[PDB]
Design a protein around this ligand. Structure first.
Ligand SMILES: O=C(O)c1cccc(O)c1
Length: 175
């Protein structure tokens, strides 16, 4: 896929609303790649953690995005994926057990969102949702990253998640 241009407007929309950082993320093998991000120069600075700036590749098993994108696959394909690349711990909170990681991916499947709190880098939080195409294929993930000292976990649940779901929903018809 190569359609990050029409999405740039929705992301700035979500940021001007909430002062946070939104992105579209693509799964490549075992790392996930940001392909668009919300940028408003009048209020956002250009210094950002690992992966909040566009370009950087992060491991799938520690990001809210990456866990969302693995939940779609079948269980045996997930298993064959955890076998290949493994789960290297990065913070005191990374999911490194296998039975635990499968039961998360099944819960992110059923529930359609993933909140990951400090599971890749200390002081960073994110909520992600799947972004589908017309055919219903999961094609990317849309996520909201911030620092745990500025945003509380239920604001992400109570407020961001509704907006996230509306925005994913209106992309579906355009991609
Ligand atoms: O959970 C994420 O998608 C995420 C995004 C950026 C940095 C990070 O540590 C995690």
């Amino acid at each position: 896929a190569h359609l990050p241009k029409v999405a740039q407007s929705f992301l700035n929309l979500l940021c001007a609303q909430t002062s946070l950082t939104f992105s579209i993320v693509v799964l490549d093998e075992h790392e996930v790649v940001p392909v668009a991000r919300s940028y408003l120069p009048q209020q956002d600075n250009r210094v950002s953690p690992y992966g909040m700036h566009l370009g950087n590749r992060l491991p799938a098993h520690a990001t809210s995005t990456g866990k969302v994108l693995l939940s779609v696959l079948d269980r045996e394909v997930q298993i064959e994926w955890i076998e290949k690349y493994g789960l290297k711990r990065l913070t005191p909170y990374t999911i490194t057990d296998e039975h635990t990681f499968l039961e998360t991916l099944d819960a992110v499947r059923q529930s359609d969102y993933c909140l990951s709190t400090e599971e890749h880098e200390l002081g960073v939080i994110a909520i992600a949702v799947p972004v589908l195409n017309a055919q219903g294929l999961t094609i990317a993930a849309l996520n909201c990253m911030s620092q745990t000292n500025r945003v509380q976990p239920q604001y992400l649940i109570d407020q961001v998640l509704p907006l996230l779901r509306n925005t994913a929903n209106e992309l579906r018809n355009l991609v």
